[model samples]
Target chain A: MGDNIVLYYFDARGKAELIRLIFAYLGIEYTDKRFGVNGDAFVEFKNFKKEKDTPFEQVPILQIGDLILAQSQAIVRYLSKKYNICGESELNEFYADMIFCGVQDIHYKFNNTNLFKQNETTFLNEDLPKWSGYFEKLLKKNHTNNNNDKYYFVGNNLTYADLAVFNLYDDIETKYPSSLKNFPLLKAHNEFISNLPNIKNYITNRKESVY
Target chain B: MGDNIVLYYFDARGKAELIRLIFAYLGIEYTDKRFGVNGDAFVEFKNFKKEKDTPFEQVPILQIGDLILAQSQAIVRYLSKKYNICGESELNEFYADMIFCGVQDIHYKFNNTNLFKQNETTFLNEDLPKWSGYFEKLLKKNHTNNNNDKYYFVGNNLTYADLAVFNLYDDIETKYPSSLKNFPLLKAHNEFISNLPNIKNYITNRKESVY
Candidate 1:
């Protein structure tokens, strides 16, 4: 087996973008099999549900030969370890995992707790600032802010934790323009990672997604 | 440095119980640091907002030395790796993560989507069976109706995926008595794990919590 990694997702960057970034960073060529919900692709994607080895009948699957895995974070974690950029130390890995999962805490609340899905003004004024401050606090202490320290979240190497924060802010930039105003560290970090040479080609050439 | 693991959560079996089970299975001693809402413990827990290394500012933290990590899944993922019980292969670990995250999927919807918090009938009839069936589907496929398979979700050895499913059904039994009625495979798997000698003592002696 030449070891092919096939990714199945919506033609969107919502969940699978980070995985794509990881693949790009590792210089791994893989299939980005996408499905759109608007027509034939949706039905074809749904048909894979019965054949999938996953618990949840969902997408954003990373299939390696006979083994197909579900859950975006699950696939990302496996890829992180497989490609070997998780973190330098075990504790750093834990830190990476911690930071990555921590962002979901707010994202979950943003959709769950808030009544209006399109209420940008209220969200920008309240929820965005609160969550932004939380991230800002964490970033101030992160080594990425220290140019002398060659690290993003934990050790000298850039980890999945950095990508996690990057995607969160990257996706929400237009929705919450000034939210990053007070979070210079996180803002700069997201920009730095987005333009990184390893994943720049994929970012520039990637299709615009619904999410 | 010798590692001393400490778990911090509300005195609830909601999220941190899986981590407790992991420690118990490994026979590792850890401080089950808990805070309650009735007392000022609620405020004390909230104070971690500014002090946390995580952005989301929530608990279910697994602290080792100075590294106070956040997120339940992140902590469990790390501990699973550190303890060498994560999985036999990358695919297996991915499966374990998928199962764990799948359970959280239902719990998230239960809290986020529902209007009446304590309305058991709607949740029992509408939500429980729906999500329970999702777990049941995987359980059957995992063992392929082979009663001889010693493991619950995957591999011959017990994994965190088993504990994740067990906790989901176990906690809901009181709320939805008939939820487990239809899922024999998952039900048996849950009972098997609950009574396992390695971690059975903790399960037997564990305190009931407010969920």
Candidate 2:
């Protein structure tokens, strides 16, 4: 079933990028179908919509043969389990979900309004710092506990939670560099994870998009 | 460790209720320590706060023997795994999380300032019906596929997702009864789960609070 997984979304990092990153890291062959911001793409998306079994009227749906799953986080998580990236223990999985959900809240706040209209102080002082502090504190605690050398968040071996943190950190460096300066540990961890052999290769070789 | 698990929280149903319900359903004896609304309770909570190792300054923390777990959702999920409510297959677990998170989003919108303050036209004509329609559609698909006997969202036996939905639906009935009038399947599902012998007894015997 190589290349059988199909991801449906518009051309943006909006929600699908995390799933893309997971696939890239796992070396899984899948189609990344993007809808451009034009009449043609809109019509294409509409046609696909007719065939969807989505409970929610949204994109970032994953089609695996006859079954279609909506909800970006769910799809990413499903892949995480399928690829054995979920944590070693149930506790680790729960912690991973907690952190992922936290990052999602930050993204929701940023997207609910026009970012251009907002001042740098609002973004830096209010939003970025809050999230950065949270991540920084988590990293500090985890590092102090000497858990960093392990492959993932809970115990030894890579987990979806680690991937999630790496993805969020990538967003910060690419889109909000200055905002991340204060969180040195978080920055270092981000760098460490992104430079993993498979992930680094994926980052270097993937087709560059506006996002 | 029977009756050794102690839950710390205020007398509210917002976050801690799910864990409490799990303990109740599993017939696990535990201490339910709820602080009163007065100055004394506030002082007690503050004192307890000093002993916590939480990165986040929040309550509804769960204490099991020497370990303390932060985050209410994490606590509930951990308990679910400990009690074997997650499910047999990984896919079932994913679907259960998917549905629980979906229900959680609906609750978040209702509580968020933006949606709560909207006029009736905006609430009913726009938001309420939209969410209600989404659930109605899901129920139709779920029932039509003959998946209802699955006591939980994932499949045939009761899981944490069912408990989460049952608790949320109880809130809707007591707090937003009018908003829930249009979705018959949701109402029926809630009622069906609520009547399970253990759950029914818990609801009847548990102390009443305005959560």
Candidate 3:
């Protein structure tokens, strides 16, 4: 049951990192079949056009024999649902969705900054409100009624939104390095996810590459 | 039973139309609570920042009693699953996802062409092979083994991917007036969904916008 998942991405994590993190958290074993494995040409995607099942010829494609998923977020959603981490209720799932979408936007905006060689100071100062600040605001909404000290993004326990938000913070810090000072809540949340035993171990050994 | 699903989009159907069409097909009653109903200021989203549940400050929101859902794709996924249109199995859901993501990318790329006032002829000719041609290619997949008598996305019955692809074609044709001729499979698929009795009625009275 553990070996069924095979995730395809570049050598660097890129969009597939979150999916990998989810598998780690759930303790599910999956093959991390990143393209250009062991330092080679990433020509695996060259013949992707011949695969009829993929609507888009791209990676972050999670494959299980016949199932071919192309988009990263959609793969995240399917895995979250199957692993029983989506949410406790439909409403909470919606809440998780909202956060996941925001996390994606934050990831891409930071990528835009990197792609354009944007001024880091300005992006952190001026664009923070539009990106990370919005997540801080949403995380503030989910208040725990339980006695446990762990902070979660939905209901009383961790959800996929937590992982997604955690990834956003990781990505920003890994990219911007100067991002967390202004957004205290997001910083603390990042610290919380970063400290989890399984996730921490995975991140420690995970390839440090251009995110 | 009819009033529970309340939709919040702009005066036009940018992303909400597929959900609307699903409701129509399922014979479910819902409110099309479009903003700018009186054709004035659509400032409902102005104070959305203060609402803690929403991570992103945008519309095409779906409300069910106390639960408020943002992100159009998330909402679409939720309703599609609930209404039994997502797919028959996990693999089918993944297939639908590949198509839905493709549909969204196609919609936005056309927007890029128009919003930037880039060369329409060149975009339609050159850029489209990269965009819509991919969908056409996928539809050419899933050669139906059932009685649907068509290249229905997953199994024989319609999936959310069908509606998504249909919407991409519909949006482009209504705006461009002379679109989809180049892609025969996509054009025929559009015509198939276009003639559905409920969708046809809905489209006849649907509002026209600049998109």
Candidate 4:
């Protein structure tokens, strides 16, 4: 909300992409301060960490005015609430929050796919299907409830949950092309959300990353 | 808030403990339907999954009336907001949520400690110090800002962030005795929160688990 708003994260769009998407939709202006993972940029990040009071010494921190907020989900939720895109009612908010948290779970598993000797097969076959089905189920339920005209994950409007799922699924669909085959509803929802003018502009113009 | 409140989780105190602690602090009554991770109860849990619609086929879901809420942090935040323990203001809520999310990160690492060939030393030495220091710094900051007589993580009152941190640190302090050595403020905060009559009652009587 402040003119001094700045977001700090790595060069890649891992956890910070959702926040960026929200800003894009809101048509708000903020500084996207990303640090490179190597060379002098990495050194700058380390020095920046020492100077800034990040909550967990982590990136993906948002500095609004004098307040520095850490935790990617926390930042996204705060921005969502501030911009009134969280939900329409208390129950709707809960639904949105639940879906957003589930998206975070999928992101975590994706990040740690190769770690712990966990192969990509487990993630693609087991994790992706399970979570994508969860997303598809929500979309289908909402679609039926909304007279088959809308494709939102919660309520009859677009919330941060939709954006978060879209951001994560963009990577999932790219890495595993057949993962969304079973979830026709989710695939359609993803396309609809991404085709929004603001979201489409951001996704098209922003630098691409593997994540 | 509903008469038909039911919390489903494992017999162990994992993600569900913060929700339990909040219920304890608020003096609310609910059915804590725990599923034993063994033969009979495990089979029952599977059947329960088939009957009810969980967001991610995961436990620690809260059923209030006809609404089923999933995700541990999502549930905790919902209950906290409903009961007025989240924070006094939006920024304070952001602070509280940030801390709670950090605690979730710690819990994730704790759960996957052995899975990734990571040993206890890494957790106790590296992860513990990093997170414990973060908690200690927040407590110290609040203490200095609150006339030197407070230990709460956010604002001047008790919040779910405090409870979440206390629940996680309870396991950390027990498994690694020396983990809290450098964080006197955090240690004091932990003791202060645990000694709250409602929290104390729950901690003393709740079944012990290795976490």
Candidate 5:
């Protein structure tokens, strides 16, 4: 079933790793096609572009048999829906989607620093805390609303938002150790997802990359 | 049913126009709570931040009774799903989403020039054609794949992607006439959506803005 699914991206975690995380957590197998960045990201992308008909000339595209999908969020959201990890109800799905997009806001800001080789001092000090604090409040609100011990984002189940939030904070922690120290709930959320048996195995065994 | 729905944004189209277009097309009623931009966009937003608890300090948030959902794309996507304008099937939904996001990539780039008060000649000359050409190709692909005469992006129906693609090209045309002369499908797509009775009414009667 998984053999027909293939994901193409650069060697780095970049945009493709969250997808990898999703597959690992769901225990699904697919070919992880990586284009080496030895010649630089742009050069490798040029090569990929020459060979593949990517939508809008971007990466992190998913190939499922004859059908191909592009846009990282589109691919991720499609997979979430197909795998039943989106949410239980429409309202719950809205909550999950809002949280996922919120995480994306942070992800884009973080990438700007990496993309321009700019110092992240401003982003780390100002943007990170502001958005992370917002997520912390969301987690607290969801926790109180559900009144449960479970740490999932929407209702009680482990939705894709949980995995995405976990991935964001995990990347932050990996790139800048102790950066997430201010947000305890986010830390707990990351730790909870990290120790999941399947995800734990994947995180522990996966190759290291700065981004 | 729509009375409980509240959409917040500035007066200009900005990101809120897509949501506005959705409501107009679907004939849904909602409180269009627009904050005036008379004092400049940033100054007005500062005032907004003072009063409203915006998630991540961004506008284009939707409030449903007690639940508040943030992020423009999330709000649009949620409304699309709720209104049954997303797509016919899972695969169709994927195609619709990818197209919607592809349009968003263009929107963001267009905004950067407007945001920093930079001249848009480079963007108009270099960026617009590239993405618009991509959409033109997509329209051609879907047209051939379905072997039909419809201009919809996914399957045979008018999905949110159609509205979004229409909105992008419309904004471009409104801001810069004769810009889409090269892509006839895009122009035709815009013209088709523009003339829809309800949408045409909305467009003809809506306030004019440079954006």
Candidate 6:
């Protein structure tokens, strides 16, 4: 049953990348089945489509034994709960979800743009300035009021929310390196998490798998 | 803190209605702070916005003591978990979310359409058939599988997914009565849940709220 976590997706970092990162960060082993973009892979996925039983005939279906689950956000949230990295309290969980969703919205909007087309003016001037500003404000508020220790999104411990934020920040930085400069607080937060003992080791030993 | 579950929204049942329904379904009491369509309510909500937080803007913020949470879907998901109506398993939860997001997409697309004024044939022939077919397929699978005893979306028990489906079906039947005749399983599912003891009483005995 433990080995039932099977993630099926194309060989791209489009949607399933965060889940992969989560597994890597937590040192969990699961089958990472990547189908190619052409020929047999697409045909195999299409052939498996079982109408409404498979609700939304799409990829990134996480199958746990006989139980197949769809929806990327749903899968991530389920994993977050399963791993006890959701948050400490209900409020914390809510905030975690709020920040994650905000980051997801930005990615959804800019997903189609090619890497070369992404620029600081488009991101830093528009996207980062808006979302990172929000992150900075939240961080400042929590720092002043909560006096939180350790580098995480919710309380003092590392949560899925922090991982989600780190992944989003990394995506942005990879695309638009200059955008990270203006948001000093965000940069600090990102760097703080990346330098964590476990996460840092994971990053150093991580495979360069895109999808 | 118990009474801190104050819902702020306009008198209409656009977005915040689901939260209200959840409260009613769970037998939890909350202050239904209805706002008018005029600018007064919007202005009032703006004044109490979080001073320094990410996504600091306001429209339908759920305040619990000093903690404020935003995002409609996140709020619903939180309430569903708090009330134990999320689902019995990970697969059930994922299916619930899948259906909910699909319904949300359909709503967003045809929300502003004036059914009478617009091309009714186009909606009936194209849009309604597409979504209704999906719903029918799902219902048929549930019926065939015997996964649960009740007319719910996820498990044998009532979940937010059921309420969401019921609510959307109610809208279609109320606004476009003629369009519903093509999908019998969806109609049956909606009718079965609507007549559930608690829900029926809530519908019949409750005040004439817009939702």
Best by DockQ: 4
Residue-wise lDDT of candidate 4 within A18-67, one digit each (tens)?
A: 89999999999898987875457678789889989887888888988888
Q: Candidate 3, which segments miss by more than 4 Å at Cα? A: A2-4, A37-44, A47-54, A115-122, A182-184, B1-4, B37-54, B115-122, B148-151, B177-179
**Model 1 lDDT, full chain set:** 0.73
lDDT of 1 by residue, A1-211 (tens): 3768788887777778888888887788888887765567778677767666555667888887876777888777777877777887787877778877877766654544334565656667787788778776776777554584343766777888777777777767634454676777767777778788886777788777646
lDDT of 3 by residue, B1-211 (tens): 3337777777777777788888877777778876665555346545443552454667777778756778888888878877788889887886787678767776877766664575687767776666767776776676643443575777777888898888777777766755577777777778888788888887787767765
lDDT of 6 by residue, B126-186 (tens): 8778887877887677663574345666667778878887777665555665555777777
Candidate 5's residue-wise lDDT over A1-211, tens digit each?
A: 4338889888878888889999999898888887774667678878878888887888888888867789988988998998999989998888889889989988887777653576588788888888889888888877634544467878888888999988887777776657667877777777888899999999889889866
Better of 1 and 2 by lDDT: 1
Which docking category, incorrect, acceptable, medium or high, applies to candidate 6?
acceptable
- The C-alpha stretches of model 4 lying farther than 4 A from their native spots are A37-39, A114-118, A144-149, B37-39, B114-118, B144-149
As a TM-score, model 6 comes out at 0.80
List residue ranges in candidate 1 displaced over 4 A: A1-4, A37-41, A50-54, A109-122, A144-151, B1-5, B46-55, B111-123, B144-149
**Of 5 and 6, the candidate ranking higher by DockQ:** 5
Q: How many clashing residue pairs appear in each of the predictions shown?
A: 0, 2, 0, 0, 0, 1
i-RMSD values for every candidate model: 1.8, 2.2, 2.0, 0.9, 1.0, 1.8
lDDT of 6 by residue, A102-201 (tens): 7777766556455577553565567666777777776665663454334565766667777777888776556555565776666777888788776788
Note the B-chain TM-score for every model. 0.85, 0.85, 0.86, 0.92, 0.87, 0.83
Interface quality of candidate 2 as DockQ: 0.48
Q: Clashing pairs in model 2?
A: B150-B155, B150-B156
Q: Give the winner by TM-score: 2 or 4.
A: 4
Lowest summed lDDT across 10 adjacent residues in model 6 chain A is found at A144-153
The predicted structure with the larger DockQ, 2 or 4, is: 4
- Model 4 Cα lDDT, one tens digit per residue, B1-211: 4468899988878788888999999998898888865457688789889999887899898998888999988899999998899999999999999998898888878776773485877887688788888888888888655555558888889999989988887866555575676788888888888899988998889877866
lDDT tens string, model 5, B48-138? 7787777678888778886777888888888999889999899898889999888988888777765357658778878988998899898
Model 3 chain B worst lDDT run, 10 consecutive residues? B44-53
